[PDB]
Design a protein around this ligand. Structure first.
Ligand SMILES: [Mg+2]
Lengths: 258, 181, 155, 330, 175, 52, 193, 51, 53
């Protein structure tokens, strides 16, 4: 878990399976006893620890003396989802979908080709996967998030055409599978109630957007009172108006109302 | 079930409370001698027993506790040492590599020593004493007195020996207490 | 199996329904009902696929994984390896030696320490005649007689 | 004076039984910190019980008289006494009913927004702390199975203060954990800065302890040079900021009592190693590092912190759950 | 010739320097190491191990006043049958038990008699039938067997022997 | 040495546990109580910024 | 792979050689350390050296482990009055080799005694130790430092309170002697029957 | 439980004499037809004697 | 052989029993039930032939 894939890595590497190699495993790095050759007893915790900690740091491991990228930041996680949505759905297809939806309210899908339908479905699937991956980092960074990225949280979902759940829509159901066979081993961050955690995360980020808007308004009012004059900047006025209209419209699109 | 029995009521009443508390047992099983305790686990040689089964160990060379110890020559009887088979698996592989420097023949023999891991659950001891036995004389005493020493022991200081290496005075002269009282 | 609870949780078995290698299918047909009736607690995850991995995986109750290779292996051997999987706990790996017979050390009477039998000194079986002692009349007569006898012989 | 004389005797390893009986039988005087520091060395169980009763009485008397210096000295001495005690249950009960954590944290330099936060959230961390620290892997696997079992088909979230015993499920997700050592703060804090730079990665975490924070405070208040004081003050404010933000992991004294083995004395040097041992024993798949100085003696435990030739400890005393954690440094 | 190459390749990480960098040098080193370790384990390890355990037991006996020689001889005499490993375990973890064993060896307690040879009961010479009853020797053998049954542990069969022997009479239905 | 072995015997008697740390560690950690520094900054029990 | 650095300490190096009594290595225990007193008045040199080494190396302890070098501090007193049987002080040679060519030094026990009486006891202790520990410099040097030799009877080790170690030589043996003849005491019942 | 077995039928001679009576002792010298030399029984001879 | 129904023998196997490859159809089986001969690998030559030198 140390060398292969971290906590918020979009990669999937089975740490005990060498599927990214162009050569048979000749030498075993982490070896404790001479009897580790004919039966390495790998998979046991006390030996896979040695092996995966003797493995060298990869591009995502960010070795000690090397700098470590800021990943737990909401202001970086939001543009990640936005760029993934842009990589999934192109601008032309996005405009076509927006026009079709605003014209027929999800009733004239026959105009879209089957290839475009499959592109939309694959984009929604990849967005759901990356949200499931970033969920712990998002719940970590929700504390000190900024209003722009809190709104981008809904902007990216709208762009990817994924309606967030609220107590098309693809975050409503879980992946089918019997709980007795599903993977539950510790150490691997894998949420099991995605429609239940993303919904409360959306509620929390709505409350956070409300708090940030109220904080901006209170700071503006305190500045005006300290100046003892009603002299507001045109940039600030236009920004407040456009951000209010934008948050209203983009939350009404998802279905959440302040 | 851990009580002592003897046709002498006095010695029975004297030795009954001395058989309480934790007890260890030196046992003989699988051609090996182990020292089992109330909660100690041991890996005995491969036994044809199903995992998660309660078993009892027959041979018991010795039993002991913080106050007593019963030896068996050669074996003991009345000791109920019950364990539970925790698992059954191979141990660490030993690789025997036989190579003759004269000829061209190398033999690689792997030996995974199979063994059953067990956890000793409970240990009970209930002996049948015959009577108080004298140490310095083979005669078996007909009476038992918990106050008087069954064998008085005296210091070793004669004075006849001039070169006798003298220890400290309190080490040479130090009586003992009475445990049975 | 510790305190009445199996350590092995899942047994992953991958096979193919039409390609070949009838060993795993023989195992699933003949010995799988017996194993499932013997150990209903473990969950057997069967995976049909085109190119199956000829290996059995055991996932235990602590995340540990133990895999056995069963390529062109008889279903009897497959059943034996499965029983070895459900028998082992796969929590450690220690050799078989005199120092490893007992997994943890403990004493009920007490651990030996240099000051346990340090002040205990040697003694004698019975009381020995002292050198500085008050001689009774009988001892006086005896020793004086011995002295006089040896002096008489010398004289 | 009599208490410090008894403490000097117990440091010379010859405890005056007469002085001890006098201090234990003479009432109408709250026992100072030296007495409870000296009693911590002895192993007499009724002596420790009577010392615990006297400690409760003296803490109540100090709280009534509102003497901060005496209260803090008594807090430190009683902390050492609770670490030396055997019954972890009564030790944790005493700690949580006398409120050692909040009062001790109020004494540090910039540890106030974390002190009051811990005092507020102590009701939830206690519930999140599990019962037995044995088979933590199995416990969290059972929790994962429970979470996977959806009960439905078959409130506003606020991230609380980071604590190891409560967030055991978070360290297994964390790949690398750096445990801080007070001796690191010598002539510079850039190593601690580089440590806290890796926290926003989501993979690296930082573990500080109350013992380490107390060591930092005392070495910032007394030291031969001024660079040491400045660096330790800067490190204290950095650690306080990281804790109040919710990135580094803190060990309250209650959790320290619950984690450390029974009857074993612990300090800034032994606590690091017992935490490392607990991590390597219960959470094997997390890479643990120690941020120590190139001159600290606790860097090599098997030669400096090792005890004597003890027959009840073998070379495998770490990978077994029956042996105490401090049995690993052999 | 079967050179253990594919097996010993995976242990090269234990070596250092050129033996770990290059392949053949490390393979030669590992081959020689395993061969000499097997030879030592077969022909020379047991000697050193038993010498160590014997020295420990001798020191534990000398701290009490005896030696390995006399202790071993008297253990063989008293027929205690305790291996040197168990003697060392007792000396290290049960000093009171080891001291009691030493006191037993030192005292003049009569060692157990040799095992009695299996004898034939006197009833085997009785004419049977003397002219539907059981053989007397067989009945005595059954009685001794039931006695040995009841002698091993407590069971709900009871301490009496006649009622347990006469169980066929109970199972028999009155005609 | 006599006082040391007496204290050690008493500890072995009344411990009812296992001791695995060095016995001199506590003395090395509390040597600040034995020594005395007459500087402006002298360490005492419960020293904190609220005190100074 | 373990690795010992080539840059080791040396006798010409200013850092110097350490004292194992002051060292703090892992394989060096100091808790279970007792102080024994051994008077060498009359006792022979090899016998007293063996008796001292058996307590120095810690072989008398039941938990003795070859790796862990633990032992007791033996204070040998009255080495100046040590006794060897006749003609040995003159006939027993002590030889060694130096780096110079033909430097085969050969001294008598008398010469080594008139030079320094403690040197003889130290040499015999070194021999009795190297009898079992000669492979590792640690295992062959660390025990020797636990011996406290003293020529005269005075010694500064009065605080440690050394116990007067008692030891019996393996030479004591009673050869069969003639059964002494004495008068028999009869009995009235024996004379009656 | 346990088994104290020396022969097939678990019977043995009375190991403990009457209270006050002199106990019986085995032969310490080896079974040698010559009186000289008198040799103590080794442990292997003791094992052979005990069975 | 088991003494009771409650305590059956374990299923731990030896090397002889474990190290056993799959069964290939032999001439007796192919002559008894010719439904198994479905491929060219089933047409094995005379069992007297061991193989190449
Ligand atoms: Mg062998």
């Amino acid at each position: 878990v140390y060398g292969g894939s971290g906590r918020g890595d979009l990669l999937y590497e089975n740490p005990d399976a060498r599927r990214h190699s162009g050569r048979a495993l000749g030498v075993l790095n982490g070896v404790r006893h001479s009897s580790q050759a004919t039966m390495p007893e790998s998979g046991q915790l006390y030996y896979r620890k040695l092996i995966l900690h003797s493995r060298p740091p990869n591009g995502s491991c960010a070795g000690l003396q090397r700098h470590c990228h800021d990943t737990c930041n909401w202001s970086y996680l939001i543009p990640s989802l936005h760029r993934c949505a842009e990589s999934a759905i192109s601008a032309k297809l996005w405009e076509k979908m927006c026009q079709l939806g605003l014209e027929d309210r999800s009733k004239a899908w026959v105009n879209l080709t089957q290839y475009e339908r499959q592109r939309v479905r694959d984009g929604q699937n990849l967005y759901r996967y990356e949200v499931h991956q970033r969920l712990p980092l998002l719940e970590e960074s929700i504390g000190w998030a900024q209003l722009d990225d809190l709104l981008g949280w809904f902007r990216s979902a709208r762009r990817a055409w994924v309606r967030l759940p609220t107590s098309s829509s693809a975050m409503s159901c879980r992946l089918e599978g019997h709980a007795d066979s599903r993977d539950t081993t510790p150490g691997r961050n894998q949420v099991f109630d995605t429609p239940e955690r993303v919904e409360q995360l959306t509620e929390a980020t709505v409350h956070r957007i409300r708090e940030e808007l109220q904080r901006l308004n209170r700071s503006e009012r305190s500045d005006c009172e300290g100046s003892a004059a009603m002299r507001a900047s045109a940039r600030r006025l236009a920004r407040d108006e456009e951000l209010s209209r934008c948050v209203e419209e983009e939350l009404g699109w998802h279905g959440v109302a302040l | 079930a851990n009580g002592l029995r003897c046709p002498d009521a006095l010695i029975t009443r004297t030795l009954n409370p001395l058989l309480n508390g934790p007890k260890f047992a030196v046992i003989y099983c699988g051609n090996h001698q182990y020292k089992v305790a109330v909660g100690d686990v041991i890996a005995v040689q491969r036994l044809r027993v199903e995992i998660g089964s309660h078993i009892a160990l027959k041979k018991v060379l010795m039993v002991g506790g913080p106050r007593f110890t019963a030896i068996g020559r050669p074996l003991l009887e009345g000791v109920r040492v019950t364990a539970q088979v925790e698992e059954q698996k191979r141990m660490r592989n030993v690789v025997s590599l036989f190579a003759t420097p004269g000829r061209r023949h190398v033999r690689w023999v792997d030996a995974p020593h199979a063994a059953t891991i067990i956890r000793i659950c409970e240990i009970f001891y209930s002996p049948n004493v015959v009577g108080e036995l004298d140490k310095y004389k083979g005669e078996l005493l007909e009476t038992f007195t918990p106050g008087q020493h069954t064998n008085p022991v005296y210091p070793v200081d004669d004075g006849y020996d001039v070169f006798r290496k003298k220890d400290k005075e309190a080490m040479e002269n130090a009586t003992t207490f009475l445990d049975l009282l | 199996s510790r305190n009445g609870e199996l350590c092995l949780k899942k047994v992953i078995i991958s096979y193919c329904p039409s390609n070949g290698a009838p060993n795993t299918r023989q195992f699933l047909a003949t010995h799988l009902p017996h194993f499932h009736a013997k150990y209903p607690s473990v969950s057997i995850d069967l995976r049909p696929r085109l190119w199956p991995e000829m290996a059995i995986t055991g996932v235990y109750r602590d995340g540990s994984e133990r895999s056995y290779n069963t390529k062109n292996l008889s279903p009897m051997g497959i059943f034996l390896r499965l029983n070895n999987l459900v028998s082992t706990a796969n929590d450690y790996d220690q050799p078989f030696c005199a120092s490893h017979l007992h997994f943890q050390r403990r004493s009920v009477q007490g651990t030996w320490n240099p000051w346990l039998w340090n002040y205990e000194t040697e003694r004698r079986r019975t009381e020995a005649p002292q050198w500085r002692r008050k001689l009774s009349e009988k001892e006086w007569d005896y020793y004086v007689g011995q002295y006089s006898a040896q002096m008489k012989q010398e004289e | 004076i009599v208490e410090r004389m008894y403490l000097v005797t117990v440091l010379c390893d010859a405890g005056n039984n007469e002085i001890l009986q006098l201090l234990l039988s003479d009432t109408a005087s709250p026992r100072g910190p030296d007495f409870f520091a000296a009693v911590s060395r002895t192993k007499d169980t009724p002596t420790k019980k009577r010392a615990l009763c006297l400690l409760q009485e003296a803490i109540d008397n100090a709280s009534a008289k509102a003497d901060k210096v005496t209260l803090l000295g008594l807090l430190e001495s009683g902390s050492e006494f609770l670490l030396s005690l055997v019954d972890k249950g009564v030790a944790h009960t005493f700690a949580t009913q006398n409120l050692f954590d909040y009062r001790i944290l109020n004494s540090f330099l910039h540890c106030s927004l974390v002190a009051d936060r811990l005092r507020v959230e102590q009701s939830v961390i206690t519930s999140l702390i599990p019962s037995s620290l044995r088979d933590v892997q199995v416990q969290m696997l059972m929790s994962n199975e429970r979470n996977a079992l959806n009960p439905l088909t078959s409130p506003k979230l606020k991230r609380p203060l980071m604590t190891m015993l409560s967030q055991l499920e978070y360290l297994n997700s964390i790949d690398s954990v750096f445990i801080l050592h007070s001796s690191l703060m010598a002539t510079s804090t850039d190593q601690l800065v580089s440590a806290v730079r890796r926290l926003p990665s989501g993979k690296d975490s930082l573990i500080v302890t109350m013992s380490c924070l107390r060591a930092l405070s005392v070495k910032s208040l007394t030291s031969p040079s001024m660079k040491e004081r400045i660096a330790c003050a800067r490190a204290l404010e950095i650690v306080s900021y990281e804790l109040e933000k919710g990135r580094a992991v803190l060990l309250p004294f209650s959790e320290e009592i619950l984690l450390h083995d029974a009857g074993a004395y612990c300090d800034e040097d032994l606590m690091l190693w017992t935490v490392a041992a607990f991590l390597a024993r219960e959470l094997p798949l997390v890479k643990v590092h120690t941020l120590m100085h190139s001159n600290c003696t606790a860097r090599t435990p098997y030669r400096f912190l090792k005890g004597g030739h003890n027959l009840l400890v073998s070379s495998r005393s770490l990978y077994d759950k029956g042996a105490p954690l401090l049995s690993s440094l052999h | 010739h079967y050179r253990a190459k594919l097996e010993l390749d995976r242990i090269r990480s234990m070596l250092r320097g050129r033996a770990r960098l290059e392949r053949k040098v490390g393979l030669k080193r590992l081959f020689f190491l395993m061969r000499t370790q097997t030879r030592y384990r077969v022909e020379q390890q047991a000697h050193w191990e038993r010498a160590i355990v014997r020295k420990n037991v001798d020191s534990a006996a000398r701290e009490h006043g005896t030696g390995w020689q006399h202790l071993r001889n008297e253990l063989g005499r008293q027929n205690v049958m305790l291996l040197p490993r168990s003697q060392q375990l007792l000396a290290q973890y049960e000093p009171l038990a080891f001291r009691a064993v030493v006191e037993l060896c030192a005292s003049r307690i009569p060692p157990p008699p040799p095992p009695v040879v299996a004898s034939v009961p006197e009833e085997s010479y009785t004419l049977w039938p003397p002219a539907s009853l059981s053989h007397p020797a067989a009945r005595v053998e059954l009685r001794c067997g039931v006695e040995r049954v009841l002698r091993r542990g407590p069971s709900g069969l009871g301490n009496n022997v006649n009622e347990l022997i006469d169980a066929w009479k109970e199972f028999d239905v009155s005609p | 040495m006599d006082t040391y072995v007496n204290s050690r015997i008493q500890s072995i008697i009344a411990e009812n546990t296992v001791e695995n740390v060095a016995l001199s560690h506590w003395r090395r950690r509390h040597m600040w109580n034995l020594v005395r520094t007459h500087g402006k900054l002298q360490r005492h029990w419960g020293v904190s910024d609220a005190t100074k | 792979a373990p690795f010992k650095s080539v840059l080791r300490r040396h006798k010409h190096h200013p850092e110097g050689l350490p004292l194992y009594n002051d060292m703090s290595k892992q394989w060096l225990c100091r808790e279970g350390e007792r102080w024994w007193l051994l008077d060498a008045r009359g006792e022979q040199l090899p016998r007293v050296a063996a008796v001292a080494a058996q307590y120095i190396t810690g072989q008398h302890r039941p938990d003795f482990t070859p790796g862990m070098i633990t032992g007791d501090h033996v204070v040998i007193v009255n080495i100046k009055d040590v006794v060897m049987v006749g003609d040995q002080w003159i006939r027993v040679p002590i030889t060694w080799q130096t780096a110079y060519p033909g430097g085969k030094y050969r001294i008598r026990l008398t010469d080594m005694y008139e030079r320094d009486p403690c040197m003889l006891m130290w040499w015999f202790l070194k021999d009795e130790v190297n009898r079992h520990f000669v492979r590792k410099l640690k295992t062959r040097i660390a025990p020797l430092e636990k011996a406290w030799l003293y020529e005269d009877s005075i010694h500064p080790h009065a605080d440690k309170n050394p116990r007067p170690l008692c030891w019996t030589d393996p030479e004591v043996k009673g050869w069969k002697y003639r059964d002494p003849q004495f008068i028999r005491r009869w009995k009235p019942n024996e004379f009656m029957h | 439980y346990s088994e104290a077995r020396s022969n097939y039928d678990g019977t043995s001679l009375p190991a403990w004499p009457a209270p006050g009576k002199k106990p019986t002792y085995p032969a310490a010298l080896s079974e040698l037809r010559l009186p000289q030399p008198r040799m103590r029984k080794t442990r292997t001879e003791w094992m052979y004697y005990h069975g | 052989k088991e003494f009771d129904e409650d305590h059956p023998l374990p299923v731990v196997g030896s090397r002889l029993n474990g190290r056993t490859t799959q069964h290939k159809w032999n001439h007796w089986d192919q002559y008894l039930n010719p439904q198994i001969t479905q491929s060219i690998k089933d047409l094995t030559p005379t069992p007297e032939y061991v193989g190449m030198r």
